[PDB]
Amino acid sequence: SLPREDTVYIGGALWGPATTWNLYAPQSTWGTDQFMYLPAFQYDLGRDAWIPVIAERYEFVDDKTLRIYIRPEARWSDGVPITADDFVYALELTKELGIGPGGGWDTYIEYVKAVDTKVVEFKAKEENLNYFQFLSYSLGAQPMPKHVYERIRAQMNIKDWINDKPEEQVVSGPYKLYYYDPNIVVYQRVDDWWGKDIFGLPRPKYLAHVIYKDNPSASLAFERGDIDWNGLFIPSVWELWEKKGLPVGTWYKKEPYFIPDGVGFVYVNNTKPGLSDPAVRKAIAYAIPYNEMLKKAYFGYGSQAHPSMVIDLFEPYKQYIDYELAKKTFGTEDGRIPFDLDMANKILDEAGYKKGPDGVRVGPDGTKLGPYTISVPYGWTDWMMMCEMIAKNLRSIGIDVKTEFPDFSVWADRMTKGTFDLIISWSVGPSFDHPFNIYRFVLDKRLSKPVGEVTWAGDWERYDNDEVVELLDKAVSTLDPEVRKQAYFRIQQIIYRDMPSIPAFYTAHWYEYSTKYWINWPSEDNPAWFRPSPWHADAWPTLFIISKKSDPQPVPSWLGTVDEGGIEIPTAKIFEDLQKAT
Numbered sequence: 362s363l364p365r366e367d368t369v370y371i372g373g374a375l376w377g378p379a380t381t382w383n384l385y386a387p388q389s390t391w392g393t394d395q396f397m398y399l400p401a402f403q404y405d406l407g408r409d410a411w412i413p414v415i416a417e418r419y420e421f422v423d424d425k426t427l428r429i430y431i432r433p434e435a436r437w438s439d440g441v442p443i444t445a446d447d448f449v450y451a452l453e454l455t456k457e458l459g460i461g462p463g464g465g466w467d468t469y470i471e472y473v474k475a476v477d478t479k480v481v482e483f484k485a486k487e488e489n490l491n492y493f494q495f496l497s498y499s500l501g502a503q504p505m506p507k508h509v510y511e512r513i514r515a516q517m518n519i520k521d522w523i524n525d526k527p528e529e530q531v532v533s534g535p536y537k538l539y540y541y542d543p544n545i546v547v548y549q550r551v552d553d554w555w556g557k558d559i560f561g562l563p564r565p566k567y568l569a570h571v572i573y574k575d576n577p578s579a580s581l582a583f584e585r586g587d588i589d590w591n592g593l594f595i596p597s598v599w600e601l602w603e604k605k606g607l608p609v610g611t612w613y614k615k616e617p618y619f620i621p622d623g624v625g626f627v628y629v630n631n632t633k634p635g636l637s638d639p640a641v642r643k644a645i646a647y648a649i650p651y652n653e654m655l656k657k658a659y660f661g662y663g664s665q666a667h668p669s670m671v672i673d674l675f676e677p678y679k680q681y682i683d684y685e686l687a688k689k690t691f692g693t694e695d696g697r698i699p700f701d702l703d704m705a706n707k708i709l710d711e712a713g714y715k716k717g718p719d720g721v722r723v724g725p726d727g728t729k730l731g732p733y734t735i736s737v738p739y740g741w742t743d744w745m746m747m748c749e750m751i752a753k754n755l756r757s758i759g760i761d762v763k764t765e766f767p768d769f770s771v772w773a774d775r776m777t778k779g780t781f782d783l784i785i786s787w788s789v790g791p792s793f794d795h796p797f798n799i800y801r802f803v804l805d806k807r808l809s810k811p812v813g814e815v816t817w818a819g820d821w822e823r824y825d826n827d828e829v830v831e832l833l834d835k836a837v838s839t840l841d842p843e844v845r846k847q848a849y850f851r852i853q854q855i856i857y858r859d860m861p862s863i864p865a866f867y868t869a870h871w872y873e874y875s876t877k878y879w880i881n882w883p884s885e886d887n888p889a890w891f892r893p894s895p896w897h898a899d900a901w902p903t904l905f906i907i908s909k910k911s912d913p914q915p916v917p918s919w920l921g922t923v924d925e926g927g928i929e930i931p932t933a934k935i936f937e938d939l940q941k942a943t
């Protein structure tokens with residue numbers, strides 16, 4: 362049905378059935394955030410700069426008051442101008458519903474206000490001034506169509522709205538839904554997209570994602586040429602081009618093949634009996650076979666995470682790690698947690714957990730350490746294998762854990778609602794505000810929700826610590842890096858004490874491409890965009906960079922900093938402007 366040469370087929374981004382195209386619903390479908398609803402500015406991790414997208418510029422009124430100027434051209438796909446009211450609406454709705462884009466904004470932002478039709482004003486909250494969050498929530502603000510949502514709300518509960526009618530869909534991005542069924546989701550380019558003159562059009566007319574059940578089936582499709590843009594775990598991926606002579610590639614031609622995405626955690630639900638004990642969580646950390654599982658299950662595609670949660674793959678981040686503390690605590694050369702069952706057993710012994718007749722430990726208050734599950738989505742074979750290795754080792758120390766692999770949608774439900782025991786899941790990655798971003802996402806009770814209520818905003822494990830809140834509130838009250846560092850250092854002490862959840866490995870930014878129909882994919886040799894994975898929040902520029910093999914097009918002129926000839930604003934410039942405005 363779809364013209365092959367005008368379609369990008371995608372793998373590894375959509376797992377389980379389509380759900381909704383509504384960012385205020387408990388679940389939405391891959392492609393909704395990525396391609397349908399764009400931000401004011403798009404952060405460019407690769408260049409540490411910001412693309413003015415829906416916004417054309419900003420101006421600091423003072424260091425705590427930021428105006429964002431919406432492009433005159435920015436217009437919803439139904440013809441209605443994108444206006445400041447749309448920005449206010451999106452954030453106020455998220456606050457009202459307790460779910461939706463920009464969760465947590467009202468903690469660090471005093472107000473968002475429409476000061477003119479095309480001018481939004483954001484004011485930082487002074488009591489707990491945080492310059493990083495001020496910038497994140499403002500520059501990265503996503504508008505949502507007020508005139509559409511107020512309509513839906515008169516008809517039904519917004520949380521129940523599916524938004525699955527292609528003709529009726531109102532979007533700010535260059536794609537909208539075209540067709541879906543239990544086996545596929547397809548998006549079609551919006552040819553009269555508001556951004557067509559400033560950004561050009563993305564090259565593919567259709568984005569199609571067949572819903573594969575597992576990694577092997579998606580891999581089989583990729584090998585035969587039926588997937589152009591892949592975000593999959595693939596065993597021995599180099600064999601695809603080395604041995605099988607396929608026209609496929611990755612970011613790196615050599616080991617490790619993938620750039621890093623962020624931090625993969627073993628999340629441990631703090632609300633569960635047994636798992637609520639810091640001692641038990643610490644024992645679990647020592648029982649994970651880091652090296653062996655990353656070699657065998659993960660094919661060396663990523664390495665062990667530092668327990669500080671800081672991504673030490675990047676030199677500039679190391680200054681934020683208290684290495685002496687980590688080394689002292691864990692007894693290793695760099696402060697990484699060793700795989701040490703003797704230690705895991707000792708920790709449990711000293712916390713008064715004694716093995717019963719069935720070999721499962723029982724605490725002093727009579728709490729048995731099990732039964733528990735460790736769970737990841739069905740078909741995610743690398744994580745599944747990890748889970749088996751972890752579960753076996755936990756069983757050996759007297760924590761009764763068995764693996765369970767439900768459909769993605771069910772897994773996500775249990776994760777977001779905090780009804781899981783153990784899971785492997787993602788967190789956040791490198792960014793201008795790292796590692797504040799990861800402490801905020803993983804440790805901040807303010808982003809969590811009660812057990813039974815969905816949160817995608819953070820703290821799935823329902824960790825609850827008020828000192829961490831205080832530290833986050835003061836960490837960026839000034840831009841002095843020492844203030845930041847000292848807060849991070851104390852947070853690290855708290856992490857090692859409480860083991861709220863376990864940073865385990867640096868997740869791979871899964872990204873493979875076929876050059877059969879589509880060329881000029883980003884890579885080490887063509888590093889045009891540093892977040893090209895099809896599931897990544899920030900993937901969209903990839904679609905403007907590639908072109909048809911039979912109709913090659915030039916590099917987008919807007920990529921690059923202003924000084925280089927593009928339109929991107931370096932982060933340093935934004936901070937300069939902020940400081941100027943004091």
Ligand SMILES: OC[C@H]1O[C@@H](O[C@H]2[C@H](O)[C@@H](O)[C@H](O[C@H]3[C@H](O)[C@@H](O)[C@H](O[C@H]4[C@H](O)[C@@H](O)[C@H](O[C@H]5[C@H](O)[C@@H](O)[C@H](O)O[C@@H]5CO)O[C@@H]4CO)O[C@@H]3CO)O[C@@H]2CO)[C@H](O)[C@@H](O)[C@@H]1O
Binds near residue numbers: 871
């Ligand atoms: O290796 C195992 C397995 O991987 C399958 O590829 C996985 C990959 O491993 C995961 O890392 C990748 O995780 C990304 C998710 O796909 C994506 O949905 C999640 O998008 C974030 C987004 O970054 C964030 O901005 C969005 O914040 C909003 C919150 O949702 C709201 O709660 C809050 O209120 O408002 C903000 C908006 O301001 O949240 C979403 C959801 O977390 O980003 C993840 C990390 O990049 O997922 C891939 C699967 O799709 C691979 O396919 C298998 O082959 C392999 O076995």
